Structure 1
C-alpha cells in the first residue's frame, strides 16, 4: 500500500512538464474534499435525516432536496477557498457567483452539486457533475465568462456516489477513473486512459416519453428492439440518474439519450453543468455526444441555465441515430 497513486499525484505528475501555476491541482484537490464530504453524508443520509426537500424551487423549477443544499454549499465553499476560481455556475443558483477578488483564481466552474435528485430517496446512484473553463477575457469576472462552448473545456468530469464512490476526470489527453478509498479518504487511480467501445449493446432512455418522441428516436428504439439483420436486440437500462447512466455507457458501451421532444424543444438536461461535462468526457474517451443535429460541445450558450438535448456514447451507436435524424431531415 506504500506507493499511492492518488488523484492529486496524477494531476501533478502530468501537468509538471506542462508547467503551470498549479492552481488546477488546487482546484481539484479542493473539489475532492467536497466530494468526500458529500459521499459520507449520502452514505448515512437516512440516519442523519438528510432525506426530504429544502422547501424551495430552483431556476429550472426543480423541487430542491436537503442534500441539494448541503452539497451546493460544500462545493461553493471549497471552490472559493481554493484560490483557483473566479466565476461559479451552479444548478442551484439563478445567477453566476463571482468570487471575491482576494480569493480569485483563473478558472470558471460550472457544476451540478447533486445529480439524480429523483433517485435520492430510493437509494439509487447519485452524483456530482462539473466542467472547468479558463477565464479568457481581461475584464472583470462575470456570468459571461461561463457562457463558453463546451469545446473550450480544460477539464470536466463527475463524482458517482454508487456502490463505490468514483471520480471520473477528463482532461485534454484522456479520461481516468479514481476510486474513493473510504479508509484513507483519498481518490486512487483505478482506470487509466479509459476508452469507450466503438459499439455497445445497451440503450438507455426514459420510454415513458414515447408519445412525445420525434420520429427519429421512435425509429431508433424500434430498431434496437427489432433489429433488421436478426442480430440480438439491445438490452435496455435506465437508472434515472444521468451520472449513473452515462458512467455505465462509458465502461460498458452503448448509448444514452435525453432527446428533444414535442413538449421540450431543448430537452431537459442542462447544457452548462450536465450536458457539456459529459459530452467532453465522452469525446475524450473516443465517443460522441450530439443533440441529434449538432455536437453539444459546439453549442454557444446564451443562458447559464440553458437546456440541450443530448445523445451520447459509442460512436457507431450515436452515428446510427444521427443517420436516422438525417434521413428524417
Structure 2
C-alpha cells in the first residue's frame, strides 16, 4: 500500500505542456466547485498560464474572435489552439504547433507537435500525445500532479458502438443515413451495434478511444460544414485518435490533411476504430 513517484517525460515544449496541465488542474477545480462565467474563467486561466510559459507566440481560443498574440517579451516558438471548456463530463481540448500572425495557427493538423484533451469526470483524465503514441493520465489533486495510468493507448480495430445525434435524421446526408441503417440492420447476420451519445464531444471521443467504435458529427442540412471546430476540437482529437491507431475523416479527406481557411472554421468529423471509419467511407464513396 505504499508508492514511489518518478518524474515522467513524454525545453520550451515541455514547459508549455507543464503550463497547459497547470491550467487544466485549475479548470478541474473550478468545474468540481460549480455557465458563461465558468467559460470566461477557464479561458483566462489557459491564456494567462500559456503566456507566462514563455513558449508561445500565438494563441487561438474557441472563446476569442481573433488570434491572441503573446507579448513580445514572453514570446516563444509555439502556437496553441484550444477549447478551454467544451460541453455530464465536460472537457478541455488543445493542439500545439511550431510557428508572427494568424498564418501560424492556420497549419493543417499534420503539423501538430503535441495535442491533448482533458475530461472532467469522477476523475480528471488527460489524454496526451507528442507524436509517439497516446498516454493517459489522471489528475491527482492531492499532489497537484498528473499520474500516468496507461501507456501507448491503442483503439480496437473494430468496435460495436456508434455515436451520433440521431435526432438530426431528417437532415442526414445519404451516406450517414445508409451507415446508420447498416449499424441497426446489419446485412451480414451480425448483431446490431449499440448506440451511445453523451452530447459532449470529449466524453464521446474518450469513450470511443477506450471502448472502440465510431463517433460522428457529419455534415447535415442545417450544418453543411458540420458543427465541430477544426482548429481546436477536430484536429486535436483526430491527432489523438490517429496516434491510438484510429482514423478521423471529414467524409472526403483525413481531418489532419484539411488546409484551414479560417481560425473558427467548422468541419465534419467522423472518427474511431479504423474498420468502422472505413465502412463509413464506403457509404460516402458509393453515394
User: Would you call these one fold, judging by a TM-score over 0.5?
Assistant: yes
> Any conservation in 2 of the 1:171–1:284 contact (CA below 8 Å)?
no
Structure 2 unaligned segments of length 5 or more: list them.
Answer: none
1:269 maps onto 2:258 in alignment: no
Report how many aligned residue pairs link the two structures. Answer: 286
Equivalences for residues 1-329 of structure 1 within 5 A:
2-5=3-6, 9-11=8-10, 22-45=11-34, 52=35, 65-116=36-87, 124-135=88-99, 141-328=100-287
Report deviation, 1:167.
1.0
Structure 2: distance between partners of 1:41 and 1:87: 25
Deviation of 1:306 (Å): 0.2
Structure 1 window deviating more from structure 2 (267-276 vs 175-184): it is 175-184
Q: Distance in 2 between matches of 1:29 and 1:201?
A: 36
User: How much does 1:208 deviate?
Assistant: 0.9
CA RMSD of aligned residues (A): 0.9
Q: TM-score, normalised by structure 1?
A: 0.85
Deviations 1:290-319 (A, max 9, x none): 011111100111100000000000000000
Q: Which runs of 5+ in 1 are unaligned?
A: 12-21, 46-51, 53-64, 117-123, 136-140
Provide the C-alpha distance between the structure 2 equivalents of 1:5 and 1:78, rounded to a whole number of angstroms.
24
Alpha-carbon separation, structure 1, partners of 2:201 and 2:19: 24
Q: Please list the CA deviations of residues 111-158 of structure 1 after superposition, one character each: whole Å capped at 9, or x if unmatched.
A: 000011xxxxxxx100100000001xxxxx111110000000001110
Normalized against structure 2, the TM-score is what?
0.98
Deviant stretches of 4+, over 6 Å: none
Partner-residue secondary structure (3-state), 2:77: strand
8 Å contact from structure 1 (residues 5, 189) kept in 2: no
Cα distance in structure 2, aligned partners of 1:67 and 1:319 = 38
